[PDB]
């Protein structure tokens with residue numbers, strides 16, 4: 001989408017995976033989907049260094065709406081859980097130097113059952129723009145036809161453009177198309193800043209594995225379309241929650257960097273370990289994810305329960321990730337000729353290699369004839385940056 | 391097995407899950423199956439407080455043998471990887487105050503392909519006894535018939551008895567029967583100190599879940615068989631490795647305590663986080679696992695992606711574990727009437743409840759009519775101890 005936005009993958013925070021559709025503010029005031037929760041997240045995004053690291057978009061997902069539209073047919077936030085309204089919340093978020101994302105649905109209802117936007121694309125777009133919304137995630141539930149799906153996504157894209165406000169447009173179009181026909185990614189990229197390809201992530205290593213396996217299986221179809229203004233979205237970062245071991249969190253961070261993925265944290269910023277915070281705020285890994293060249297990486301090799309992925313970077317640099325998919329035993333040795341990396345260009349005549357994950361370590365100079373040997377933890381990933389000696 | 395051993399579930403360390411059958415001591419010296427590895431593991435078991443916590447048996451698994459037997463027809467340790475032999479390794483292990491476990495197979499070969507014990511049961515038992523072995527894990531690979539499997543397990547049990555040396559006998563008999571017929575657990579318990587029921591564990595939450603689900607599915611068949619001298623073995627503790635989140639590690643520790651399981655760590659004691667160490671050395675949870683009553687716990691309730699397990703303890707106490715099996719979202723609230731716990735005995739007339747996991751916190755006095763409210767993390771477990779009491783506050 002050539003709206004001048006998302007020139008690097010969007011970074012921010014999205015409530016869905018961690019907080020879902022919790023409406024019980026009587027019994028659970030501190031985790032229900034409310035204006036107070038988003039105020040607290042915004043405060044911590046500023047105070048705990050998230051904004052400094054690049055996490056900029058504070059995004060509302062499903063279950064913010066009142067059960068019905070107002071008298072004039074516009075969407076409204078729930079009166080009790082969002083007493084001051086979305087425009088006021090956006091004002092507060094902007095006063096912190098942050099941007100506000102919101103959620104809507106192309107069909108007749110949101111996935112959780114709140115008002116859909118079908119029939120209201122222009123009024124809903126203008127409402128969001130009036131509110132000061134900076135991002136829209138557009139879900140695909142309750143849509144009866146592929147025609148309605150495509151027409152709705154394109155229509156909302158154009159309506160957002162017509163409002164004249166810069167609004168990042170996040171689509172689930174491909175995901176809801178795939179069961180029936182193959183998405184045309186050129187068209188999607190024409191209309192969307194990023195797009196969900198695969199099933200919702202949850203707080204599990206199984207989820208990570210299946211997202212990675214789907215991405216690598218379909219990479220011939222999705223890798224080359226990505227670039228500044230339009231990214232593949234493998235869904236939220238779940239680092240800092242409950243289901244991932246340290247090495248699985250490392251794997252998610254490293255490979256979301258390799259895949260030039262939007263980095264939407266979905267966790268509790270009020271209760272997050274120092275270790276998870278340091279991983280999510282890792283300057284070198286984020287810099288890889290945010291590389292201005294914007295070329296999505298890919299799986300280079302697969303075998304012996306090992307995976308090698310790589311991503312071309314600005315200025316003749318490359319990122320290389322090595323995953324150990326064997327879920328038994330200990331750190332396993334993997335070796336590869338450096339001439340086999342970066343299409344044979346990365347280390348010709350030589351490269352300096354710096355390991356970034358799980359720990360940062362200068363590995364030294366590697367000649368074009370050299371072999372890179374590493375030990376990779378079960379379900380963990382080793383992430384490396386290669387700098388050609390020029 | 392009435393040999394006076396394993397009156398509580400055996401505690402120790404077993405190399406299999408973390409180190410497997412790594413024979414490449416040239417290119418992978420730090421993880422190959424060698425005598426140096428076991429010497430160092432013993433040193434850290436003493437120095438790092440594992441022995442104090444109760445972990446006593448340093449156990450060799452598969453891939454310690456030379457490719458074939460000696461001239462005298464006995465097993466021998468691998469000349470390259472165990473140059474000083476099992477007798478000297480056992481002497482060293484005993485000098486640290488520990489006991490040595492070893493591995494063998496009922497069939498013609500070990501699962502990794504080394505000499506089996508069929509045809510040599512008495513010589514192998516006497517070999518181990520001469521070496522100073524204190525525990526034997528007896529695998530079931532390369533056995534063609536239930537005839538041979540059963541006869542071999544019974545035979546090796548009696549052969550070990552014949553030596554006059556106290557040797558804990560760990561069997562995989564039930565697990566290897568399943569392809570043919572359901573185990574007779576009274577008979578197995580007659581011959582074994584503990585027995586593997588289910589497929590090998592690996593370093594994954596999927597593995598923990600499948601072991602737990604199998605155990606709770608089959609609990610009417612196996613729970614009552616367990617007791618002092620004979621335990622169900624749900625396989626090794628994998629806390630301290632790579633595949634489990636903190637909450638999943640808590641779940642494994644809590645429920646291995648609930649199940650009166652043998653506690654065989656399989657990790658690298660040289661590279662283990664302080665948090666995993668504190669969990670594995672948790673005095674109160676180990677005390678639950680080691681409760682002298684020796685009655686195995688069970689799944690009390692299941693539903694809405696929640697599980698409630700409980701274990702009766704000596705002196706009218708109970709352990710209660712609450713698992714959140716929903717793998718999305720945040721901590722979920724669960725409430726239960728205390729009268730539904732401990733068969734209605736735990737909190738009659740009252741109980742004092744102490745949470746032990748994920749953190750230790752006294753919750754207070756709960757009267758028989760009261761309700762317990764808790765919040766449980768996704769894939770985590772809340773472990774509680776209920777102490778029956780006649781006091782009210």
Ligand SMILES: *[C@@H]1O[C@H](CO)[C@@H](O[C@@H]2O[C@H](CO)[C@@H](O[C@@H]3O[C@H](CO)[C@@H](O)[C@H](O[C@H]4O[C@H](CO)[C@@H](O)[C@H](O)[C@@H]4O)[C@@H]3O)[C@H](O)[C@H]2NC(C)=O)[C@H](O)[C@H]1NC(C)=O
Pocket residue numbers: 392393394395397550551552553554555556557
């Ligand atoms: C070879 O097999 C035989 C049996 O097939 C086995 O003999 C058994 O040994 C056990 C353990 O020593 C005996 O049980 C003990 O019996 C005495 C006398 O009746 C009791 O005082 C003992 O009580 C103590 O230990 C108990 C735990 O076992 C505690 O519950 C108790 O509080 C006491 O501390 C204990 O019950 C058993 O009587 C014999 N059985 C027979 C038939 O002789 C022998 O040990 C085996 N040998 C080897 C090397 O495995």
Ligand SMILES: *[C@@H]1O[C@H](CO)[C@@H](O[C@@H]2O[C@H](CO)[C@@H](O)[C@H](O)[C@H]2NC(C)=O)[C@H](O)[C@H]1NC(C)=O
Pocket residue numbers: 002003004160161162163164165166167
């Ligand atoms: C509406 O769409 C137009 C055209 O697709 C966008 O115009 C582009 O804006 C970028 C940066 O602002 C320029 O580099 C391109 O050259 C522009 N293209 C054209 C054809 O003018 C415009 O940004 C969109 N407006 C909104 C509010 O989304």
Ligand SMILES: *[C@@H]1O[C@H](CO)[C@@H](O[C@@H]2O[C@H](CO)[C@@H](O)[C@H](O)[C@H]2NC(C)=O)[C@H](O)[C@H]1NC(C)=O
Pocket residue numbers: 184185186187190
């Ligand atoms: C996928 O969609 C794109 C855009 O809708 C199609 O590309 C257009 O093709 C027409 C020819 O019919 C050209 O006039 C346009 O210039 C193209 N646009 C772009 C941006 O390339 C493309 O044909 C579609 N692919 C398939 C297989 O249907």
Ligand SMILES: *[C@@H]1O[C@H](CO)[C@@H](O)[C@H](O)[C@H]1NC(C)=O
Pocket residue numbers: 106107108118142143144145148
């Ligand atoms: C919404 O519902 C109406 C009537 O039930 C139907 O005609 C229309 O196609 C629906 N829209 C979508 C996007 O499913």
Ligand SMILES: *[C@@H]1O[C@H](CO)[C@@H](O)[C@H](O)[C@H]1NC(C)=O
Pocket residue numbers: 496497498508532533534538
């Ligand atoms: C071991 O191999 C011999 C030789 O073929 C065979 O006769 C015997 O039955 C085997 N034993 C077992 C337990 O499989």
Ligand SMILES: *[C@@H]1O[C@H](CO)[C@@H](O)[C@H](O)[C@H]1NC(C)=O
Pocket residue numbers: 574575576577580
């Ligand atoms: C199981 O084996 C034991 C030992 O022979 C015997 O006492 C018991 O009756 C057997 N049970 C069945 C069901 O055969």
Ligand SMILES: CN1C[C@@H](O)[C@@H](O)[C@H]1CO
Pocket residue numbers: 016061062110111112139200
């Ligand atoms: C099912 N949708 C897609 C998922 O990403 C959330 O946005 C949820 C909201 O209902």
Ligand SMILES: CN1C[C@@H](O)[C@@H](O)[C@H]1CO
Pocket residue numbers: 406451452500501502529590
């Ligand atoms: C497959 N066996 C059973 C498992 O517990 C190990 O002992 C392994 C040795 O080869």
